Design a binder for these strands. Structure first.
Ligand SMILES: CCC[C@@H](C)[C@H]1CC[C@H]2[C@@H]3[C@H](O)C[C@@H]4C[C@H](O)CC[C@]4(C)[C@H]3C[C@H](O)[C@]12C
Ligand SMILES: [Zn+2]
Ligand SMILES: [Zn+2]
Lengths: 195, 150, 227, 50, 44, 196, 763, 110
RNA sequence: CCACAGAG
């Protein structure tokens, strides 16, 4: 994480001077953000890999991940090793103040510890800025869960009202209620996906 | 008169370098932020001293003081002497090129404040039914500001 | 891609968000050919080719002078000439300029004259403010074009617009394998069967992006219902 | 799946507190550390991880 | 002022006749209860 | 730290009631050189509403073409500036006499802005022309309505303009000044705790 | 022996005097003390229309204090009111001066209705009462108070949150491509919204009263700025792109042949739709519309139209800056742009409407009687005031009880203002207070008001919000906050002019954007040469104690302006000042605090701690510990775990948990079964849950200690063995112990109340 | 045109009147400025951005052909740097780009 | 008949 922080700081200094290279074709801010996100994802993946490799057998989260009953590799990596970058609406933590995230960080800064990366394990406890950023991520997850249901149910009702009349007649032709053919054979071969 | 009636083209400055030419526009007519404030204070103090030396015994020359609206009270030669008369203070200047204004027993800081881009003049008015007269006493050449020091 | 994408497909909407048109190229293993075929479909405004636009009053005449540099044309390899810019200016509807006022001065300058109160100033001011936003080369609905590389190394062109027929009819782009994610354009260009294929492909791609593993026969049934 | 390490820390803190006889503080951004709980549990004869 | 309830109001909406009493309706011989596991019970 | 020379203040002129106009349409400087003050023709001061009107005879030898002005503006040849005298306490106009700085209060400040009486005259003449051709308690006005009504129904006072009064004014100010020197009453610390 | 790391002891002292439910209590106390006097002083005078000699004037008003007796009057105890289904209230005594014939009769202590007291206020019987006298009145000493007992039930006026009044909010619609700036001018007469929108590339101004969208150049000309160069210099300044955007609006005025102030004024007055009341000329109607209608909170009195013109010019400059790039638009969801209306303000507004109706009906009845010649001693007021007095208390009780909020004078309609205080647990009753309800509930905009903005660090709880459809709309106050109170602004204006602010009526319009400008409550007030030194001096005067500590000063460099906020409703947080890398609170101050003397207000008076709101925090640089202090630091956090609310404090080790689990516990700890209050057996509530053997938590929290959850717990410690004992624990299910249940684990009881009234019929 | 009045500080509208000469008339006050002799102009400088190169270094270590250059008023060079690039569809002739050795002025043929 | 408050 120190190597990742140092390389990110070098990229921030290059962006601040202005000679940052825009290889993807977007502007300087977007390519800096993409490079920082890639670097932090890489460091999370590496620390998670070494953490999973360093856990012995009869480790209960490792067993429950090998079984597939509950949890996964990512959850064990988050509890034992670095949690990783918190992502809100596809980007890092938005600047809720005047061109900075929180008043605990200096103005005009894009260092990972200020833009929403947490270097602490869930076992080791979270620093208050990391706690707030993780609270933001959990809040957006909860609100998405709360508000998807209305649109999804409306779409399901519309689909079912549209497709309620179809049936497979005894001549292997899908027909409407008014006896008009939609498909001559269901799917072109007349095979139920169930069987 | 030829330039007075010449059609005026307004000041245009590119958006990128509006802040850089701010000092130039300020100077043409007449931590980091703290250092800039000190630089402006020193330059302003030198400019005010030069301006005061310039208009020594010159007609139609005026500068407007922005003094506190509630001056320190005094003793009538307690009614606190709300309306003032006579000598009250002094513009003292120090060896380090800095200036201060001592009103009575209160020291205060001095500066120039906002700089105007238009003609100004001072006029005395006398109103009476039998006779009335408005007199142009002179031109107002700049303004300065005096603030209490805490 | 997600709930809005399914909602935007199954509810067939004439206008959508992010209407990507993907196009393959006949010469897909050369960066310069990809750039020059991008230059045809990606619209370039007059503001990208003009040093300046100015308004000059003569003694009894008033006109607008535009300085077009051939350097930018040569450096971008746009197939654009000065008279092409002139006739493109004539094809502007809001300016209401008839096609006999634009004249060529030098090999760069283009003059737009306005002829007759105070109406002449208002008209030429409107022309001055609206002129550098005119389209001179490209398609009106194509917002931008990006050259992308596929995993095998071949180059393709992704544009963001609604002009499917114009994109697939331009030379240099293969007109048989060009598709778009928008379904109404596919319908109006290539028939109801191609619309059905586009519906099936788009729904299957959106479903397989999340890895939900929906059997394609249901998707085919839905496509046969909407078409 | 729910990733509540604070529950395990609470269990060990409570065990060490009740064995020591004193209530133990689990204040946010601080509280009684895990190492002291392990030391108290070891001195009381139980396992260090509870 | 409270709007009155008309026939069109009685036939429209999630509480109208079509979506509240005809497409689906409250039924007899039913029960609602909190659930709890039982592995010794057959899946059917 | 220490002082080399003191420039004494001296407050006087508590009844002269000076005023300052602020022209909003002419620059203070043209080039690096100072500008030229306009010649003054006439002025008016409204007593109740504290309005100032200044008439400036503009140039006629160039850039006029009086034909338009006689065609629709009845041959207007002077530009008028109207301003509102607003109170601003804490303002002192100061001069320097023999290294001694003298100050005198400014009662009001006026923002003179261009005014077009003749446009209103043409408008009201047109209104009469298109209104008389075909017809087609009682006190409620407050706020700025009463002030505008006072400014309308008042009686303008014509003033006289004089120049070279600066010498007599300076002599009167220094005569009112030199007789008195005042002694402080309260300490510096007593200034802070009440409207510093 | 003491160190700086134990500075968290400022937190209990802060809670020792202020209180945790001070948001309701201070507001209601301020209402009773001052807003009654203000409401009377607004319309104390009543005159008749038939016989113009009878005048009736209220002189003084008070609640629960008779003028003749120093001792306050007798009130029923709160628990007696709860049992007997009355409303806990005190009579409203008012002094009256009227005419009996020709005699100027001064009469005192006439009752105009019963004002329902809020519990534990300065007028309640539970104020500063020791637990012995609190036990005498059948009231729990560990009760937050702050609720109104009406008709037997107990209701809570939840703290409302609104977009900041009298502020410029700039928003952009990219799909439509319109930028606009809105100002909601709210005052005693009107609450009107003014929009400055961009349509077809031209800046237009629109208002509800005005029929058509006025061009901006027309209204700028009408508002005293005759010249167009001044307009362009005000809106754009010495800039290229802004002038290129704005020149069209200058051309628009020339297209409509408007060049003088009278022309623009009559053009605007021709569009004003609210003509009534024997209207004046079109020019005077336009003058009135510009003076009051377009921006209500800035009213112009004299002929000088400077401040209104500069306000509209700054609004349009914000609009043009939005046109140049859409990144410089202020966020509507920012905490600094939201103000918190408390119970006192709403009760004052409702009492204003009720008293106006009462006075109108009283005047109507007096005119009905005195119109007839047969008058005896001018038909004294005290004979005919009680039947009108009952309407005041009827309206107050109905408005508090039903929750409906209908004020016709202010055209305001609110529903769901008060809620029934949920007595499911002590922590639930506490958490119902310090709850903030957002302004709208219909919108489902994800990543809008529902998302947790980082601006609420330490001002609102970061984990407590109800799960479900209201997730993110209902928030909770943090443990250590303080909502400001409204203050007068004229002394601040004079202090500004003294400190070096040059007034707007004496400075150049063209050079105005060449230096920083000072804003008071969002209205431009003057120009400052050196903004940094002005800000430092203002902060030093605030810290000394020569101005109110809730006045906020902050310098926004992007707008090149400096703002002073004065109005109440801003949410704040106290913090420790650090200077020169050393915290201003040394160990000697902590020892003095722990020894008993030197309370928190003494920390405020010596400049050791100070209150910052969100906008003030934007200009600061706060460290989190002693180890994090650098010479560039500005403030030091007292203690970080204040960012969790009262309910969120129950969770042990919350920073080791995933955030949704913390939110779920915040939601589900308010349903815990446990002891309700010390007098839970003398209460008869509609549904109450009690536990036989509650126990203390083995793992406590400092937040638990401060809110006294320790004394009245809800839950038992269970010896848990985390293992898969059987197949019956799959999918979150638990495996209880039969013997443990038999011995008393989890034993609970439910109490229900059935009420009946023997109505005495009219027969 | 953004000229401002020197009397009342207003916008200058150019009008022809009826004689056919354009003047910087001001409708707020009697003032105009005829444009006889010298002419006036207002230039708005459009931005100049660095766009992506397409033929940057496309003629390094390449063969040189013998073609007559169209510009014969500057150079008499007959050796031209050429490059074959498929630009149109596969059923059309392959276009090529080639330039003079002295005066540049690149040109293409199909 | 509405509006709160929770449970999925
Ligand atoms: C400014 C926004 C323009 C936009 C709303 C207009 C401009 C170009 C228009 C499309 C083209 O007409 C081609 C198609 C015609 C079919 O009949 C219906 C769909 C189709 C895709 C059109 C939809 C829509 O009408 C568009 C996108
Ligand atoms: Zn003019
Ligand atoms: Zn050549």
């Amino acid at each position: 994480v120190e190597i990742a922080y140092h390389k990110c700081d070098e990229l921030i200094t290059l962006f601040n001077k202005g000679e940052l290279e825009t290889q993807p074709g977007c502007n300087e801010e977007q390519t800096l953000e993409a490079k920082i996100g890639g670097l932090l994802s890489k460091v999370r993946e590496e620390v998670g890999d070494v953490c999973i490799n360093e856990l012995d057998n009869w480790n209960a989260p490792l067993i429950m991940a090998t079984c597939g009953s509950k949890g996964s590799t990512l959850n064990v990596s988050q509890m034992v090793a670095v949690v990783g970058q918190q992502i809100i609406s596809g980007n890092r933590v938005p600047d809720g103040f005047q061109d900075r995230s929180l008043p605990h960080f200096p103005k005009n800064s894009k260092t990972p510890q200020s833009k929403g990366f947490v270097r602490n394990s869930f076992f080791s406890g979270l620093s208050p800025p990391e706690f707030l950023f993780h609270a933001i991520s959990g809040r957006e997850g909860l609100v998405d869960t709360a508000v998807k249901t209305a649109e999804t149910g409306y779409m399901s009702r519309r689909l079912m009202k549209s497709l309620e009349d179809l049936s497979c007649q005894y001549d292997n032709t899908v027909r409407t209620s008014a006896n008009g053919i939609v498909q001559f054979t269901y799917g072109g071969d007349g095979l139920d996906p169930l069987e | 008169r030829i330039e007075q009636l010449f059609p005026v083209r307004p000041v245009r400055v590119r958006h990128e370098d509006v802040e850089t030419v701010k000092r130039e526009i300020q100077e043409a007519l007449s931590g980091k932020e703290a250092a800039a404030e000190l630089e402006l204070l020193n330059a302003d103090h030198q400019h005010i001293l030069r301006k005061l030396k310039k208009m020594n015994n010159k007609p139609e020359r005026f500068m407007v003081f922005q003094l506190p609206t509630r001056l320190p009270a005094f003793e009538r030669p307690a009614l606190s002497t709300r309306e003032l008369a006579g000598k009250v203070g002094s513009i003292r200047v120090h060896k380090s090129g800095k200036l201060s204004v001592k009103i009575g027993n209160v020291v205060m800081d001095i500066g120039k404040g906002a700089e105007t881009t238009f003609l100004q003049d001072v006029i005395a008015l006398s109103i009476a039914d039998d006779a009335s007269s408005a007199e142009l006493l002179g031109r107002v050449d700049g303004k300065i500001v005096v603030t209490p020091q805490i | 891609l997600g709930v809005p994408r399914i909602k935007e497909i199954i509810n067939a909407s004439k206008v959508i968000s992010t209407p990507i048109i993907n196009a393959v190229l006949v010469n897909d293993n050369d960066e310069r050919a990809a750039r020059v075929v991008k230059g045809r479909v990606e619209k370039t405004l007059l503001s990208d080719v003009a040093f300046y636009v100015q308004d000059v009053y003569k003694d009894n005449l008033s006109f607008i002078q535009v300085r077009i540099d051939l350097g930018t044309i040569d450096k971008l390899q746009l197939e654009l000439t000065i008279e092409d810019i002139a006739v493109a200016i004539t094809r502007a509807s809001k300016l209401k300029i008839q096609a006999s006022d634009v004249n060529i001065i030098g090999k760069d300058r283009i003059a737009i004259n306005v002829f007759p109160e105070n109406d002449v100033f208002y008209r030429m001011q409107q022309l001055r403010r609206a002129l550098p936003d005119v389209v001179v080369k490209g398609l009106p609905d194509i917002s931008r074009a990006v050259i992308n590389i596929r995993d095998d190394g071949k180059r393709e062109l992704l544009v963001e617009g609604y002009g499917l027929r114009d994109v697939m009819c331009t030379d240099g782009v293969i007109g048989s394998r060009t598709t778009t994610n928008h379904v109404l354009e596919v319908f109006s260009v290539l028939g109801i069967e191609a619309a059905r294929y586009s519906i099936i492909r788009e729904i299957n791609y959106t479903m397989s992006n999340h890895g939900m593993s929906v059997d394609p026969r249901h998707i085919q049934l839905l496509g046969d219902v909407m078409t | 799946s729910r990733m509540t390490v604070g529950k395990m820390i609470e269990l060990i803190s409570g065990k060490a507190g009740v064995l020591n006889g004193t209530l133990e503080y689990g204040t946010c951004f601080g509280g009684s550390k895990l190492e002291d709980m392990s030391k108290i549990l070891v001195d009381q004869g139980f396992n260090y991880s509870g | 002022v409270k709007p009155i309830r008309g026939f069109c109001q009685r036939l429209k909406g999630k509480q109208g006749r079509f979506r509240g009493n005809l497409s689906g309706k409250r039924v007899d011989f039913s029960g609602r209860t909190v659930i709890s596991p039982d592995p010794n019970l057959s899946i059917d | 730290d220490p002082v080399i020379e003191e420039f004494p203040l001296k407050i006087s002129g508590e009844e002269e009631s000076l005023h300052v106009f602020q022209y909003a349409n002419r620059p203070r400087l043209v080039g690096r050189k100072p500008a030229e003050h306009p010649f003054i023709s006439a002025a008016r001061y409204k007593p109740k509403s504290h309005l100032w009107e200044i008439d400036i005879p503009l140039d006629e030898q160039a850039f006029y073409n009086k034909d338009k002005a006689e065609s629709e503006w009845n041959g207007v040849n002077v530009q008028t500036l109207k301003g509102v005298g607003v109170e601003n306490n804490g303002q002192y106009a100061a001069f320097v006499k023999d290294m001694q700085v003298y100050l005198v209060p400014i009662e009001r400040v006026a923002q003179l802005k261009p005014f077009f009486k003749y446009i209103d005259d043409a408008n009201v003449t047109r209104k009469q022309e298109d209104a008389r051709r075909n017809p087609n308690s009682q006190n409620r006005l407050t706020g700025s309505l009463l002030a505008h009504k006072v400014a309308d129904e008042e009686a303008n006072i014509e003033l006289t303009w004089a120049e070279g009064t600066f010498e007599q004014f300076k002599d009167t100010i220094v005569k009112e000044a030199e007789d008195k020197t005042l002694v402080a009453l309260e300490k510096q610390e007593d200034y802070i705790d009440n409207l510093v | 022996i003491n160190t700086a790391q134990d500075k968290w002891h400022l937190l209990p002292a802060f809670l020792k005097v202020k209180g945790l439910v001070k948001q309701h209590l201070d507001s209601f106390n301020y209402f009773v003390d001052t807003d009654l006097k203000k409401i009377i002083k607004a319309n104390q005078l009543i005159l008749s229309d038939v016989d113009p000699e009878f005048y009736l004037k209220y002189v003084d008003i008070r609640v629960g204090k008779k003028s003749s007796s120093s001792t306050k009057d007798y009130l029923t105890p709160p628990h007696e009111c709860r049992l007997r289904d009355m409303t806990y209230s005190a009579p409203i005594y008012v002094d009256i001066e009227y005419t009996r014939g020709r005699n100027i009769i001064m009469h005192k202590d006439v009752e105009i209705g019963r004002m329902p007291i809020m519990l534990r206020s300065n007028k309640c019987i539970l104020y500063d009462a020791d637990e012995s006298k609190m036990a005498k009145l059948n009231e729990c000493p560990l009760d937050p108070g702050g609720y109104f007992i009406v008709n037997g039930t107990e209701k809570v006026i939840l703290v409302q949150e609104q977009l900041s009044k009298n502020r410029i909010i700039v928003e952009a619609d990219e799909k439509k491509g319109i930028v606009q700036a809105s100002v909601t001018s709210s005052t005693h007469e009107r609450k009107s919204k003014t929009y400055v929108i961009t349509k077809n590339g031209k800046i237009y101004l629109k208002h509800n009263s005005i029929a058509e969208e006025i061009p901006i150049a027309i209204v700028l000309k009408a508002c005293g700025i005759l010249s167009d160069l001044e307009i362009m210099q005000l809106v754009c300044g010495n800039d290229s792109s802004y002038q290129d955007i704005f020149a069209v609006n200058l051309e628009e005025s020339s297209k409509l042949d408007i060049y003088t102030q009278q022309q623009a004024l009559e053009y605007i007055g021709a569009k004003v739709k609210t003509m009534r009341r024997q209207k004046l000329t079109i020019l005077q109607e336009g003058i009135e519309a510009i003076a009051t209608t377009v921006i209500a909170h800035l009213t112009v009195e004299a002929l000088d139209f400077r401040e209104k013109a500069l306000y509209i010019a700054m609004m349009t400059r914000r609009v043009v800056m939005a046109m140049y790039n859409p990144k410089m638009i202020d966020d509507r969801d920012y905490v600094g742009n939201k103000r918190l209306e408390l119970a006192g303000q709403l009760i004052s507004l409702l009492f204003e409407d009720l008293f106006k109706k009462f006075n109108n009906d009283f005047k109507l009845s007096i005119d009905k009687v005195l119109k007839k010649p047969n008058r005896a001693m001018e038909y004294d007021a005290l004979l005919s005031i009680n039947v009108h007095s009952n309407n005041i208390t009827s309206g107050l009780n109905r408005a508090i009880s039903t929750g409906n909020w209908s004020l016709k004078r202010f055209k305001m309609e609110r529903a769901g203002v008060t809620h029934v205080l949920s007595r499911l647990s002590y922590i639930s009753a506490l958490g119902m207070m310090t709850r903030i309800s957002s302004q709208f509930e219909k919108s489902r905009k994800v990543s809008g008001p529902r998302a947790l903005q980082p601006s609420q660090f330490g001002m609102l709880c970061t984990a407590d919000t109800p799960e479900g459809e209201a997730c993110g709309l209902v928030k909770n106050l943090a443990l250590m906050t303080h909502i400001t109170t409204d203050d007068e602004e004229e002394p601040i204006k004079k202090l500004c002019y003294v400190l070096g602010v040059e007034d707007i009526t004496l400075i150049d319009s063209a050079s105005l954007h060449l230096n920083y400008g000072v804003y008071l409550n969002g209205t431009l007030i003057g120009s400052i040469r050196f903004p940094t030194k002005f800000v430092t001096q203002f902060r030093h005067l605030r810290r000394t104690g020569k101005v109110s500590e809730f006045i906020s000063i902050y310098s926004n460099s992007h707008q090149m302006a400096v703002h002073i906020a004065t109005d109440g409703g801003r949410i704040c947080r106290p913090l420790i000042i650090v200077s020169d890398g050393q915290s201003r609170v040394k160990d000697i101050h902590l020892r003095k605090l722990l020894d008993g003397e030197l309370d928190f207000d003494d920390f405020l008076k010596l400049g050791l701690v100070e209150y910052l709101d969100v906008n003030e925090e934007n200009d600061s640089y706060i460290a989190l510990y002693e180890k994090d202090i650098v010479p560039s630091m500005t403030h030091l956090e007292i203690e970080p775990f204040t960012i969790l609310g009262a309910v969120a404090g129950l969770i042990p080790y919350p920073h080791h948990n995933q955030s949704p689990r913390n939110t779920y516990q915040c939601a589900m700890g308010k349903q815990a079964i446990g002891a309700i209050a010390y007098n839970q057996f003398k209460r008869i509530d509609t549904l109450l849950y009690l536990m036989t053997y509650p126990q203390q938590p083995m793992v406590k929290t400092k937040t638990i200690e401060l809110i006294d959850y320790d004394k009245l717990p809800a839950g038992q410690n269970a010896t848990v063995a985390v293992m898969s004992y059987s197949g019956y624990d799959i999918e979150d299910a638990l495996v209880l112990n039969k013997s443990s249940i038999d011995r008393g684990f989890g034993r609970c009881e439910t109490r229900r109340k059935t009420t009946t009234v023997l109505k005495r019929y009219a027969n | 045109m953004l000229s401002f009045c020197p009397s009342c500080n207003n916008m200058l509208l150019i009008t022809s009147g009826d004689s056919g000469v354009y003047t910087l008339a001001c409708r707020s006050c009697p003032y105009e400025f005829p444009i006889e002799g010298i002419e006036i102009y207002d230039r708005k400088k459009l931005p100049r951005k660095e766009v992506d190169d397409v033929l940057g270094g496309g003629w390094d270590n390449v063969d040189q052909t013998k073609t007559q250059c169209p510009n014969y008023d500057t150079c008499g060079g007959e050796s031209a740097y050429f490059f074959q690039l498929q630009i149109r569809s596969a059923d059309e002739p392959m276009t090529t780009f080639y330039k003079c050795v002295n005066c540049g002025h690149r040109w293409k043929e199909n």
